[PDB]
Ligand binder design. Structure first.
Ligand SMILES: O=C(O)[C@H]1C[C@H](O)CN1
Ligand SMILES: O=C(O)[C@H]1C[C@H](O)CN1
Lengths: 785, 785
């Protein structure tokens, strides 16, 4: 069904081999090699300007929208200034098991040399490493927590697109100028406001210059164009790129061209991801409505949305070799929000919502993450449509409950009107578009490794050493309640090592690594004259990535029913069994696995511990604030860390074997949800899903035959609405066969469009490692409920 | 009668040609050329270490103290990273008319030209240039004021030698380590403290490593040394440099080695000067007594004090070609304080004060400036000795009244015990040693130029632009009071412009240019974890250098006389008189010249205006605080700006002619004090000399025949004590023959040791330009009072 233009654009994205680009690396390295005493924030604006002035740019034949990250299709942009892993991990850059990257031409050496070696020891990531105390290094080694935003900028940019779409850069530039002219330096620290406004001005004029570069390219190409239809596309492009982003868009294409330009510019200034694109069906609606009444047909807009979506799919955010194994498929976590409600609470679904969903019906892209906002008065037509496409084309959208999200946000200090205008930076975490500086990556926390360390009263078998504290020798435990307290004591100590590292790191950013473009249109920054790292936003909070709950819940139900009720074994016998990885006593392993109930089967005796753990985690981290004064929130998600962190957790009492992967995110352990998906969501409702203010990341998988047709929607819609009626937040669907997934393993070339939801992002199954593929195939296939 | 060793050392300093050095310029430029995202304060510290690990060093055979700025005698260390003037003024650098410098090879181009080109547009001075508003540029151009600290660091450092000499660097390193260990980063700005302590550690361990380079070098020269006296010196030097500044010195020579290392380290980290050396006769006394008890003769200390004084006289602080002619001779303004009171108010003189004065009797060096602290209980021997030496030698103990300084410092928020430990950074401004961060260079202010603009109701005629405001039309002045109210409005306008620019600049240092070493032992910095620029000292205040006062006083007298009293002309006629430089009306200029009283002759009619003017400038600047929260204070001192600011002021009503030098500093104008030196100090008594906190700089010359014999060290007291009882602060004399200073121009190489006090600094007359020489020769010669 898709247009021929979109079929070629899609093909270029999906099939051009991704090549490492040296434009940015070369030009940034040359700018920072000019000695300077300019203040480092002004220097960084000026380095951004210099890079956008000299980098390569192309306009592909089929493109109606100007701009790519590179000067060729599928360029992979580099950040040797920020990323220290580009030194340690350099040799595997073009041999990865998750991220197919190639050099263009054995200018692998221009980068080995002239650049990565030149930066040795002086990258941002090298500064971040100096903030890690000696005791923390074993903690990081065995995977108790990770050191987030230590090789990326603070990322997670949420531009005020609702207002930017009406104003254009020149509005904010003039604001900074007006701010600058009435501002007095009375105190040394007042220079901060001067630097911030100036830097933001320099950077906004930089992007305008960048757009004018595409306009001139477009215009030269137009002069040599014989096809009248293309000649007109290019004169319209050149005209668009002289109008926008500097000025308000006049047309639907200009509005998309402004948002893309701004998105792209943010992507290139600093290493990082997770920037959102706002509520496209909302801020775009005046343009669709106007030009539609002018005669333009639905497909005019469809092709633009498709090119727009493909602009994002082409982007990369390369991470250290290790984050690329646990984040396989390279999530950008760049959301577009659809549906939800307006300020006054009435339905926000519109015609453009449907136009967009019908595009996804015809062509799905790995990114962006499409975030569909359910609410009680959601248009039923539109809701079921979104269900249709999640099952059919597969991949998107995930589904989100406005009533749960607005509760989280109000509990975080937002007003009702603000809460109604929420989106995501990251996997699933709610936030108020345009007015939040959400830190999605302080790091991850591994409750199960902490438990492992508690089962040995502070020593770690894996790396053999004392890294925790004495929470209590295991023989002294009278009850499940006694071991709960011993855990809470170990959890409290490690939660505080982690928050110390995270607070230190976010503070260091404030003295080394700005993000100017991402500040410009975050509400607060221009008004206060403070970039994001200097507390520019009115709202900061940090989500702790809690790597799973299922294994902890199950190993605690297993200890209660098998150690303290039925007394099948003391606890010293369990550590010996666990230490010895069940070598021999595999009869006993089956006792723990079958004789005690497992999470996700709507079994209150195991389900009671979900409430307990979410609560201790919330309580433990909430005795601190982050380095910008905001709360620490609970998020349950592992991405591929269930596998990678699992590799470092010995045998757990739930029956899980040493080094085997954990459950996936907040879902039950593989094989244990034997009672259908209404029971899985019923189990998650014992967490008190109004508590974790940055969400429970939930994966569900259905057999495509059983959820076929129109009654098949009714099954999915029921499972959904039942989740939401219990304050469920997020639900995420794969409608995929066990057999269909092995066919793509044996014959990847014939199944290069099966799109899987991994965690809070989607990826092409053939792009994923074989180890990660089998971990997605192990997921439970719900046959109904 | 001075030791052969001190004669040789003296010759090596006084006669080796200053040659521009490229170690710092080379090594620093090299370092800032390695790209780095490290924080710029940490980077500076590491830059500092790197330079100290690779600069050339050398040890003269006649030296017992290690360390020089260069690897040869009289090296001139360059600061291309800071000084913007190095580009625009490169060409004249080696053809200067009051500096006299030379390149060794064709390293003019070799390196130093190419190095400055590398830095082009990226020096600290370039960044400071951005802080000047458009409308301020004409004001700078015609010399209404000066952009202070725009090509230097905040400088003006004042180490806590009293404690340092007892603790060594290790004490402070360990205090940084302890504080770091306790410190939590709970807010982003808490990282400031981490960065401060770490940078101070790096910088102090760098100076220790540097000391070791000298130990290793001295040891090496010991073993090849065939003379057992010099061999023993070298082995002492080596043991010394393994001891200081890391640890508390144990000996007079070590205490001196420590002081010199610290001073020298500060001078090399960043451009600038005005660092004081403390009360040497005080903190050194325990070592002198213990070693004199042990049989060391006076001559042992006399030769260390001499070499130490020469170590400082060898130093350079190169300024731009403009400052290079208004500050002729390269003032370093590095004071050693002598005498004064102890904490309890008792006389602080001791044997070491005399030993020190005896050295100056025998050998005077241009720097350090020596400030003798007089007070009502001062030892009569010591005081009269100090006078003798000021007379029979390049006058160096200038004289300062403790009662007047302790009054200034009390009005500045200091305690009585604090104010007794006072010294100078700058020319004459009082501060509390170890506990003050005094800005001696916010910039100068030209009240006479402001007066010009007032006479033209806001216009500057030379440039024809209305750079000021509407003071009022001169044709409307009913009274001398009307003119005074007019000048006040103009003064307020330009004073606010000046303060705006100085405040912005001092803010600028706090985001670009640290002074780490000078922060280390400033009380407050290590305690608070703040370098000086981040408000580390408990006391910051800023002296506005007011370019003279005499011409203003005389002009207002001349106007009250000839315009308003005896109606010789009207205000419009006076203006035309002035706009034409008195052309064809020399009768009239003689009227204003002689029919109206002048300043410095104890005539109340004119002297009443000195109170009004000093009050107006104080009141006007007290509307504001500096950027660190401290007050602005008045410093009446022209330096040699009376020539270079003179050239931008038209004829004035006191009879001075367009382009003509102003009166020098806080003195009366050439020719006007005709009634003796005792009357000049009575005239300055109508200033109310308790009001200019930071002092009026007073120059007085005497005919050598008159004040000879003991009826000089009896008649000298005379004019001294009567200045002090009248609350006089500063009384600094030069006793040159006037016929001696003319013969010393025809035979330069024959009067190479003639040292004149030229505006709070002191220099050898055969090192000044002719224009600055013939102007120093127009100072009133007093034949007695
Ligand atoms: O690493 C990141 O980008 C964030 C994404 C997710 O919200 C949790 N960690
Ligand atoms: O320019 C300077 O270095 C200071 C010195 C003295 O206080 C007058 N101004």
């Amino acid at each position: 069904m898709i247009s021929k233009r979109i079929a070629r654009l899609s093909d270029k994205v999906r099939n051009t081999q991704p090549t490492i680009d040296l434009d940015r690396a070369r030009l940034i390295t040359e700018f920072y090699s000019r000695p300077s005493m300019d203040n480092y924030i002004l220097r960084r604006a000026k380095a951004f300007d210099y890079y956008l002035e000299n980098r390569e740019i192309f306009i592909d034949e089929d493109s109606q929208i100007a701009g790519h990250q590179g000067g060729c299709w599928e360029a992979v942009v580099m950040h040797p200034d920020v990323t220290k892993w580009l030194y340690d991990d350099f040799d595997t850059l073009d041999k990865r098991p998750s991220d197919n990257l190639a050099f263009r031409s054995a200018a692998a050496k221009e980068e080995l040399r002239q650049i990565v070696e030149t930066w040795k020891g002086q990258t941002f990531g090298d500064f971040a490493a100096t903030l890690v105390d000696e005791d923390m290094k074993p903690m990081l080694d065995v995977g108790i927590f990770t050191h987030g935003i230590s090789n990326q900028s603070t990322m997670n940019h949420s531009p005020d697109y609702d207002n930017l779409i009406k104003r254009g850069y020149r509005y904010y530039i003039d604001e900074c100028k007006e701010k600058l002219a009435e501002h007095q330096v009375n105190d040394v620290y007042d220079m901060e406001q001067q630097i911030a406004w100036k830097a933001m001005i320099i950077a906004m004029e930089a992007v305008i210059k960048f757009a004018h570069r595409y306009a001139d390219l477009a215009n030269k190409q137009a002069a040599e164009c014989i096809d009248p239809k293309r000649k007109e596309e290019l004169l319209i492009m050149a005209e668009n790129c002289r109008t926008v982003p500097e000025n308000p868009p006049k047309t639907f294409l200009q509005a998309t061209q402004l948002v893309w330009f701004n998105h792209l510019a943010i992507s290139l200034e600093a290493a990082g991801g997770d920037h959102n694109l706002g509520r496209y069906d909302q801020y775009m609606l005046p343009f669709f409505e106007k030009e539609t009444a002018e005669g333009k047909p639905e497909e005019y807009f469809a092709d633009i949305i498709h090119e727009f979506k493909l602009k994002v799919a082409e982007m990369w955010n390369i991470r250290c070799y290790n984050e690329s194994v646990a984040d396989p498929g390279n999530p950008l976590w760049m959301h577009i929000m659809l549906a939800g409600q307006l300020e006054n609470g009435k339905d926000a679904c519109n015609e453009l919502t449907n136009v967009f969903l019908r595009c996804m019906r015809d062509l799905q892209t790995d990114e962006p993450c499409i975030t569909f906002r359910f609410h009680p008065n959601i248009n039923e037509e539109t809701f079921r449509l979104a269900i249709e496409v999640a099952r059919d084309s597969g991949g998107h959208p995930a589904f989100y409950n406005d009533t749960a999200a607005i509760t989280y946000l109000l509990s975080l200090g937002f007003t009702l009107k603000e809460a109604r205008n929420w989106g995501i930076c990251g996997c699933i975490e709610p936030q108020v578009l345009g007015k939040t500086d959400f830190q999605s990556n302080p790091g991850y926390f591994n409750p199960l490794k902490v438990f492992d360390v508690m089962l040995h009263n502070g020593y770690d078998p894996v790396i053999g050493k004392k890294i925790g504290i004495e929470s209590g020798e295991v023989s002294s435990f009278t009850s499940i309640d006694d071991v709960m307290r011993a855990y809470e004591k170990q959890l409290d100590f490690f939660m505080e090592k982690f928050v110390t590292l995270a607070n230190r790191t976010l503070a260091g950013h404030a003295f080394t690594l700005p993000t100017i473009m991402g500040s410009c249109f975050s509400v607060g920054c221009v008004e206060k004259g403070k970039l994001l790292q200097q507390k520019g936003s009115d709202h900061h909070y940090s989500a702790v990535g809690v790597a799973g709950i299922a294994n902890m819940i199950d190993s605690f139900a297993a200890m209660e029913e098998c150690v303290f009720n039925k007394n099948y074994l003391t606890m010293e016998e369990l550590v010996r069994l666990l230490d010895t990885n069940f070598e021999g006593k595999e009869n006993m392993r089956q006792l723990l696995l079958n004789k005690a109930p497992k999470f996700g089967n709507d079994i209150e005796q195991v389900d009671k511990y979900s409430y307990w753990l979410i609560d201790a985690l919330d309580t433990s981290m909430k005795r601190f604030h982050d380095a910008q004064g905001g709360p620490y929130t609970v998020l349950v998600a592992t991405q591929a860390y269930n596998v990678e962190m699992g590799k470092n957790v010995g045998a757990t009492p739930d029956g899980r074997m040493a080094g085997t992967p954990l459950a996936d995110n907040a879902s039950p352990m593989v094989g244990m949800d034997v009672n259908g998906p209404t029971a899985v969501v019923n189990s998650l409702a014992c967490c008190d899903e109004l508590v974790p203010q940055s969400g429970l990341l939930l994966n569900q998988r259905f057999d495509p035959a059983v959820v076929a047709g129109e009654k098949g929607i009714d099954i999915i819609e029921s499972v959904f609405r039942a989740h939401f009626a219990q304050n469920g937040f997020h639900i995420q669907i794969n409608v995929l066969d066990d057999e269909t997934l092995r066919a793509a393993q044996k014959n990847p070339d014939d199944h290069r469009n099966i799109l899987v939801r991994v965690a809070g992002y989607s990826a092409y199954f053939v792009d994923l490692s074989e180890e990660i593929q089998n971990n997605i195939i192990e997921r439970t296939i719900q046959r109904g409920l």
